[PDB]
Design a protein around this ligand. Sequence first.
Ligand SMILES: CCC1=C(C)/C(=C/C2=NC(=C\c3[nH]c(/C=C4\NC(=O)[C@H](C)[C@H]4CC)c(C)c3CCC(=O)O)/C(CCC(=O)O)=C2C)NC1=O
Ligand SMILES: CCC1=C(C)/C(=C/C2=NC(=C\c3[nH]c(/C=C4\NC(=O)[C@H](C)[C@H]4CC)c(C)c3CCC(=O)O)/C(CCC(=O)O)=C2C)NC1=O
Ligand SMILES: CCC1=C(C)/C(=C/C2=NC(=C\c3[nH]c(/C=C4\NC(=O)[C@H](C)[C@H]4CC)c(C)c3CCC(=O)O)/C(CCC(=O)O)=C2C)NC1=O
Ligand SMILES: CCC1=C(C)/C(=C/C2=NC(=C\c3[nH]c(/C=C4\NC(=O)[C@H](C)[C@H]4CC)c(C)c3CCC(=O)O)/C(CCC(=O)O)=C2C)NC1=O
Ligand SMILES: CCC1=C(C)/C(=C/C2=NC(=C\c3[nH]c(/C=C4\NC(=O)[C@H](C)[C@H]4CC)c(C)c3CCC(=O)O)/C(CCC(=O)O)=C2C)NC1=O
Ligand SMILES: CCC1=C(C)/C(=C/C2=NC(=C\c3[nH]c(/C=C4\NC(=O)[C@H](C)[C@H]4CC)c(C)c3CCC(=O)O)/C(CCC(=O)O)=C2C)NC1=O
Ligand SMILES: CCC1=C(C)/C(=C/C2=NC(=C\c3[nH]c(/C=C4\NC(=O)[C@H](C)[C@H]4CC)c(C)c3CCC(=O)O)/C(CCC(=O)O)=C2C)NC1=O
Ligand SMILES: CCC1=C(C)/C(=C/C2=NC(=C\c3[nH]c(/C=C4\NC(=O)[C@H](C)[C@H]4CC)c(C)c3CCC(=O)O)/C(CCC(=O)O)=C2C)NC1=O
Ligand SMILES: CCC1=C(C)/C(=C/C2=NC(=C\c3[nH]c(/C=C4\NC(=O)[C@H](C)[C@H]4CC)c(C)c3CCC(=O)O)/C(CCC(=O)O)=C2C)NC1=O
Lengths: 162, 162, 162, 60, 172, 172, 172, 97
Amino acid sequence: SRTVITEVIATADSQGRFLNSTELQAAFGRFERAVPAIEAARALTKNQDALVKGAVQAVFKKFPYVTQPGEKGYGDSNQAKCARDIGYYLRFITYSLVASGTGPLDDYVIAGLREVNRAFNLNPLWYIEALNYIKGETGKLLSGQSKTEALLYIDHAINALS
Amino acid sequence: SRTVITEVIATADSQGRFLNSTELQAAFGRFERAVPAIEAARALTKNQDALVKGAVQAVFKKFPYVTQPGEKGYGDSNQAKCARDIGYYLRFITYSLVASGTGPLDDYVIAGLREVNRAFNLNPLWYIEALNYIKGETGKLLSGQSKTEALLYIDHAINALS
Amino acid sequence: SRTVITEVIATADSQGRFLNSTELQAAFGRFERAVPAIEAARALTKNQDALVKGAVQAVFKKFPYVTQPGEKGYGDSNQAKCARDIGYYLRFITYSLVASGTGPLDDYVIAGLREVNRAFNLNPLWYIEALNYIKGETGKLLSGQSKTEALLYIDHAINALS
Amino acid sequence: RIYKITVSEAGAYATNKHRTGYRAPIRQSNYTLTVPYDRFLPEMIRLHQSGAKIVNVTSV
Amino acid sequence: MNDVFTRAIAQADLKGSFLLESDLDKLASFAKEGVKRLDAVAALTNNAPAIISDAAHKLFAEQQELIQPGGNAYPHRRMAACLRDMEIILRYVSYALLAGDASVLDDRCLNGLRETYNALGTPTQSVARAVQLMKDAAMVHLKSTANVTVGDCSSLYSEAATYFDKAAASIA
Amino acid sequence: MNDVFTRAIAQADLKGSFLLESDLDKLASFAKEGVKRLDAVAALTNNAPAIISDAAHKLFAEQQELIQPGGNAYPHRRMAACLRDMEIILRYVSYALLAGDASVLDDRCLNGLRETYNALGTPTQSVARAVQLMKDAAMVHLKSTANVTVGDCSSLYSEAATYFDKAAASIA
Amino acid sequence: MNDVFTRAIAQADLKGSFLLESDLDKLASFAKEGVKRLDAVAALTNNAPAIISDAAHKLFAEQQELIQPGGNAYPHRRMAACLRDMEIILRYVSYALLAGDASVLDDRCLNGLRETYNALGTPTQSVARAVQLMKDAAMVHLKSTANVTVGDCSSLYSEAATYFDKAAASIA
Amino acid sequence: MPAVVADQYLAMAKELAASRFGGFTKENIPSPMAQPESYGRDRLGIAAVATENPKVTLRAPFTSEEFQGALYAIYRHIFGNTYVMESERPTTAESQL
Ligand SMILES: CCC1=C(C)/C(=C/C2=NC(=C\c3[nH]c(/C=C4\NC(=O)[C@H](C)[C@H]4CC)c(C)c3CCC(=O)O)/C(CCC(=O)O)=C2C)NC1=O
Ligand SMILES: CCC1=C(C)/C(=C/C2=NC(=C\c3[nH]c(/C=C4\NC(=O)[C@H](C)[C@H]4CC)c(C)c3CCC(=O)O)/C(CCC(=O)O)=C2C)NC1=O
Ligand SMILES: CCC1=C(C)/C(=C/C2=NC(=C\c3[nH]c(/C=C4\NC(=O)[C@H](C)[C@H]4CC)c(C)c3CCC(=O)O)/C(CCC(=O)O)=C2C)NC1=O
Ligand SMILES: CCC1=C(C)/C(=C/C2=NC(=C\c3[nH]c(/C=C4\NC(=O)[C@H](C)[C@H]4CC)c(C)c3CCC(=O)O)/C(CCC(=O)O)=C2C)NC1=O
Ligand SMILES: CCC1=C(C)/C(=C/C2=NC(=C\c3[nH]c(/C=C4\NC(=O)[C@H](C)[C@H]4CC)c(C)c3CCC(=O)O)/C(CCC(=O)O)=C2C)NC1=O
Ligand SMILES: CCC1=C(C)/C(=C/C2=NC(=C\c3[nH]c(/C=C4\NC(=O)[C@H](C)[C@H]4CC)c(C)c3CCC(=O)O)/C(CCC(=O)O)=C2C)NC1=O
Ligand SMILES: CCC1=C(C)/C(=C/C2=NC(=C\c3[nH]c(/C=C4\NC(=O)[C@H](C)[C@H]4CC)c(C)c3CCC(=O)O)/C(CCC(=O)O)=C2C)NC1=O
Ligand SMILES: CCC1=C(C)/C(=C/C2=NC(=C\c3[nH]c(/C=C4\NC(=O)[C@H](C)[C@H]4CC)c(C)c3CCC(=O)O)/C(CCC(=O)O)=C2C)NC1=O
Ligand SMILES: CCC1=C(C)/C(=C/C2=NC(=C\c3[nH]c(/C=C4\NC(=O)[C@H](C)[C@H]4CC)c(C)c3CCC(=O)O)/C(CCC(=O)O)=C2C)NC1=O
C-alpha cells in the first residue's frame, strides 16, 4: 500500500535510480514517527469496543429518524451492520497509524467509496458523525504526538467522506 | 531542485491531492535532519580553502603524470581550473547539505557532467580522488550524524562521477 | 447538446462523409413523433406551478425530519430554494421534451450534479422523490405516447440522481 | 511548411470535458500547437470536433 | 518547484559564493519553525472542504447573480467548476505554505489563469472575492489552538495571508 | 509491493482483526532497528559501482566463455546489458532491504526475468553466479565499521543474504 | 456487431442469393413488433439501478463470503467493481435486446470475460448467479403493464431470458 | 468454584477475542476465500504497471528531475522494456521537448 517506504521505493524505481539521501530521510522520519503512531494504534485497539458502540449511539443521536421503521437503521441486522462498518473504519485507521500512510484507508475504504454509498443509499454523514465521535474520544484517550497522528488519519477519512 | 519538500509537493500535486500524513512525515524528517546538515555546511564552509588545496594536492599525488608537460596539469591556468572545479564541487555539496537534498548537486553538477567531461577530456577519476580526500577530511572535521549527512552527499557526488 | 439531430450530424462528421440513408431517416424518426414531445412540454409548462408545489410537499412528506430546525429544510429561504430547484428540473425536462433529446438535462443538470450536491450536502433522494411525484402527476395529466415520452425524460433525470 | 495554430479552448470544449471527463489532467485554456503541412488539416478538424477555438494560424 | 532553501541556494549561486552565515541562520530558523509550519499546513488541509463550503456559501449569499440563470456559475457544471477552482487555489496556497516559497503556485497555475478566465467570461473580481473569503475562512482554522500545542504562529498567519492575497492579485 | 508493516496489515485484514499486541511489538522492534537498516541501505547504494565492478571482474575472470565471440557478453551491447542487469538486481536488493520484505523482487525485479533469459538464451547459471558475487562484494561494505556507530547488524546481513539468494534462485 | 437484419443478410450472402419471401416476412414482422421491443429496452434502461441493487442484495444474502474480510467483494474497491460489472452486463443485454441479436453481447462483452475473472481470482459461478438474479429482477420490470399499452409480449420476455441465460453460461 | 482453566489461557482467549470487533460471532467471520485486496494484481504480476507506478505528466515548464524521470518512463514504455544504449538516445528530439 501507499506508505512512506513504498512511495519512496516506487518513485525511485520508476525513475530507475537508487535510494538517495532525501528518500532515506523520509524513511528515517517514518521510523521516528513509528513510536507515537504505534502507541496511538495500541490505544485505539484497546478501546475499540467502547469507541465503536459510542460512535453508533452518536450516529443514532444526530440522526434520530434512522431508527424509525421503514428506513435504514431500523432492525437488529441494520444496526449490527452499522457497528460492523464503524469497526471497519476504526480498524483501517489503526492500520494506517501502524503503516504511517493513508495506504490502508485509501485501498480499503476510500477507493470506490462513493459508488458503494450511492448503490446502497448509505449516507456519508452517518459515518462522518461516527468518526467525529471517534475524534472526540481519541482526544481523551491519547495525548501529545499520538493524539496528532490519530487525528490526522481520522480527518483524512472524514475529508474523503465529504 | 530535488529536495524533501520538493518531492512532497510534487508527489502530492501530480496526483491532484492535498498534503497528507505520509507527506508531512517526510517533511518532519527533513526538518529534524536539518540541524546536522547545517552544522556540516558551516563546518565545510569554514574549511573550504584547506579542503580544496588538499584535494588538488591529492589529485596530483594520485595521478603524477597529470603534472608532466603535454598533460592537463601543466600550466598555472590548468591548476587554477582544477582548484576552481573542486571549489565548485564543495560549494554544491554544502548547498545539498543546506537544502537537505541532492537537488543542487543534481542540477548544477550531475546533469550534463558526462558529456562535458567527455568534450573537454576531463577525467572523472581526478574528481573522485579529490572528493575522496574531502570525504576523509570530513571525518577529522565532523563527528556525529553531521558526518553521515556530509558523507551521503559526497558519496552521491562520487557515484555520479563513477 | 446531445440531441438526436445533433448525433446524426456528429456521426456524419466523425465518419467524415455526407448524411446517408440511415442517418437522414434516423432524423426522420425524430421528426415523426416530435409532436407528442411538444404537446407534453406544453402540458408540463401550463401545470408547472402545481407540479412544483406538490413535489415540494412530497419531499417534505417523505422526509419529514428535513423540515425540522437545524438542517437544510428549515427556513422559508430553504423552502424557496427547494421550490426553485424543482422548477429548474421541470424546466429542463420541458427543454429535453421539446428538443427531443436529453442534452438539456445532461448539460444543465446532470453535468456536475454529484459534486454540487456533495459540496452543498443536498440529498439526491429529495429530488428523486420530487421527480417521482412529478412522474405520478404526468401519469394523469398526459395520455398517449406523449406521456411515454415525458416519463422517459423524467426517469432519465431520476437515473441521473441515483 | 510549418503552421503554428494558437487555440483557446472555450465553453464548447468545457461542455465536452464536463460530459466525457478528464482522463488527462486539467490544463490552461490557450496554447499553441506546431504542425507540419501534412497534419494541418487533421489537426484543424480534430480541434473543431473537440470544440476548441483557434485564436489564429501563422505560417513559417 | 522552488522552496526557501532552494531560493537562498540559487541566490548564492548567482554570486558564485557559499551560503553566508546570516543566510544559514535564517534557514536554520526556518527549519526550527518548520514544525509549526507542518501544523499550519495540516490545519489548512484537514478543513479544506469546510473552508470551501463556508466561502462558497458566503459568496453566493453576497452575489446572487452567479446563481441565477445567466450567471457565470448558474448550471451544475459551472458550479462544479467554481468549487473545483476554489479547491485548486486552496491546494496551491497550502503547497506554498509548506514550501515557504510561492514558486509552486506562481509558475504552474497563476500565469495562465488570467488568460483562461478572460477567455471563458468569468468575472475576475468574483474569483478574487472568493479567494479572500477562503482566506478569511481558513484563518479561523489556523487560529485554532485546540489539539495543538499553544504557541506563537503569527509569522505563519502573515505568510498565509501573503499567499492568499497575492494569488487573488494574480486573479484580480 | 509490501513492506513488513503492510504485510502485517494484510494478514490482520485477512483475519478481520485489529493488530495484536505482539504484532505491534514486532513492528515497533522493526522500526526501532530502522537506523541500522538505513545505514545498510546506504552502504548498498553508495558502493554500487564498486560492487558491480568487482563482481563483473570476478565473473569474467571465472567464465571466459561469456566474453568470447559467440558468448553472451561478447559485443559491447551484450556486455552493457549485462552490467545493466547487475545494476538493476543490486538496486532492487537495496529496495527490499529498506522495505524489510522481498515483495519488490518478485513483484518487479524477477517478474518475468527467467522467461526473459530463456528467450534470450542467457545462461542463467552465470546470472546466479553474478548475483552471488554481488552478494560477496556487498557483504564487505555492509560489515564495514568505518564511520558508523558500532553495533550488531548481523540480522541485516542475513536479510541481505536472503534477498540475494532469492534473486539467484528465481533466476536459475 | 450485427442485428437480426444483418444476420439474415449474412446468411443469404453465404449461400449467395436474395432474401426469400419467408425471410422478408420474418423481418417485416420483427419491425412491426419493434415498438414493443423499444418498450422492453426502455424497461431495462429506466430500472437499471433497481435491478442491480436487487440482484446485489440477493447475491450477498445467498453468498456472504463475498462481502466479508477476504471475500472478493470485501473492500469498497472490489464491491464497486462488482456493481460496475453488473451495470455493464445489464447494459449489453439491453443492447442485444434492441438489436434483436446477441452478437453485440457475445462479441463485445462476454468473450474474454471468463478468462479475465479466472485470472483475477473471481468466482465465475458467483458472477453467473448474479446475472441470474439480475435477470429475475429485470423480468419483473419488463412485464410491468403500467404506463404502457397492454398486449402480448411473451416473445420479448423469452428473448431477454435467453440473453441473460447466454451471459450466465458464457461467464460460468 | 475452583478455576477451570489457567489464567494464562484465559488471558490468551481474552486477547484473541479483543482483536475482533464483537469477539467471535457467526456474522463477523473471515471469508473462507482468503483474498487480500491486492490479490489479483499481485498474482498477475501487474501491480507495478497498473496501480503503483504513477502516470508521468510533463507540461511546458519543468525542473531537471521532472524532465529526467519523464524521459526514463518514456523510454521504458515506448521502446518496450528493451535496453536503449547511449548511442541510440535521441538528443535533438528531447531538446525540442
Ligand atoms: C429518410 C429521408 C426522407 C425521405 C427520402 C423522404 C421523402 C418524403 N417526402 C414526403 C413529403 C414532401 N416532400 C416534399 C419536398 C419536395 N417538394 C418539392 O418538390 C421539392 C423537390 C422538394 C423540396 C426540397 C414536400 C413538399 C412534401 C409534402 C409536404 C407535406 O408532407 O405536407 C414524404 C411523405 C409522403 C408519404 O410518406 O406518404 C416522404 C416519405 N422523407 C424523408 O424524411
Ligand atoms: C440549474 C441547475 C441548478 C440546480 C438544480 C441547483 C440546485 C442548488 N440549490 C442550492 C441551495 C439549496 N437547495 C436546497 C434544497 C432543499 N431545500 C429543502 O427544502 C429540500 C429538502 C430540498 C430540495 C428538494 C437548500 C436547503 C439549499 C440551501 C443550502 C445550501 O446552500 O446547500 C444550491 C447551492 C447554491 C445556491 O443555489 O444558492 C444549488 C447548486 N442549482 C443549479 O444551478
Ligand atoms: C493549474 C490550476 C488550474 C486553474 C486555476 C484552472 C482554472 C480553469 N477554470 C476553468 C472553468 C471555470 N471556472 C469557473 C469558476 C468561476 N466562475 C465564478 O462563478 C467563480 C467566482 C469563479 C470560481 C472561484 C467557471 C464557472 C468555469 C466554467 C466556465 C464556462 O464553462 O463557461 C477552466 C476551463 C477548463 C474546464 O472547465 O474543464 C480552467 C482551465 N485550471 C487549472 O488547471
Ligand atoms: C506528521 C505531521 C506532524 C505534525 C502535525 C506535527 C505537529 C507538532 N506540534 C508540535 C508542538 C507545536 N505546535 C505548534 C503550532 C500550534 N501552536 C499554536 O497554537 C498555533 C495556532 C498552532 C500553529 C498553526 C507550536 C507553536 C508548537 C510548539 C513547538 C515550538 O515552537 O517550540 C510538535 C513538537 C513537540 C514534540 O513533539 O516534542 C510537533 C512535532 N509533527 C509532525 O511530524
Ligand atoms: C567486440 C567489441 C569489444 C571490445 C572493443 C571489447 C573491449 C573490452 N576489454 C575489456 C577488458 C580490458 N581491456 C583492457 C585494455 C587496456 N590494456 C592496456 O594494455 C591498454 C592501455 C589498454 C587498451 C588500449 C584492459 C586493461 C582490460 C581489463 C580491465 C578490467 O579488468 O577492469 C573489457 C571488459 C571485459 C573483459 O575482461 O574482457 C571489454 C568489454 N570487448 C568487446 O566485446
Ligand atoms: C540521512 C539518512 C540517515 C542515515 C544513514 C542514518 C543512520 C544512523 N545510524 C545510527 C547509529 C547506528 N548505525 C549502525 C549500523 C552499523 N553499525 C555497524 O556495526 C554495522 C557495520 C553497521 C550495520 C549493522 C548501528 C548498529 C547503529 C547504532 C544503533 C542505534 O542507533 O540504536 C543512527 C543513530 C545515532 C545515535 O543515536 O547515536 C542513525 C540516525 N540516519 C539517517 O537519517
Ligand atoms: C472495507 C470497508 C467497507 C465498508 C466500510 C463497508 C460498508 C458497507 N455496509 C454495507 C451494508 C449496510 N451498512 C449499513 C450502515 C447503517 N446502518 C444504520 O444503522 C447506520 C445509520 C448506518 C451506519 C452508520 C446498512 C443499513 C447497511 C444495509 C444496506 C442494505 O440494505 O444493503 C454494505 C453493503 C454490502 C452488505 O450488504 O454488507 C457495505 C459495502 N464495506 C466495506 O467493504
Ligand atoms: C421512446 C421509445 C418508444 C417507446 C417507449 C414506444 C412505446 C409504444 N408502445 C406502443 C404500443 C404497445 N406497447 C406494447 C408493449 C407492452 N406490452 C406489455 O404490456 C409489455 C409489459 C410491454 C412490452 C414488453 C404493446 C403490446 C403495444 C401494443 C402493440 C402495438 O401497438 O405495437 C406504441 C404505439 C402507440 C400505442 O398503441 O400506444 C408506442 C409508440 N415507442 C417508442 O418509439
Ligand atoms: C525489472 C528490472 C529489469 C530486469 C532485471 C531486466 C533484465 C533484462 N535483461 C535483458 C537483456 C540482457 N541481459 C544480459 C545479462 C546476462 N547475460 C550475460 O551472460 C550475464 C551472465 C548476464 C548478466 C549478469 C544480456 C547479455 C542481455 C542482452 C541479450 C542480447 O542482446 O542478446 C533484457 C532484454 C532487453 C533488450 O535487450 O532490449 C531485460 C528485460 N530488465 C528490467 O527492466
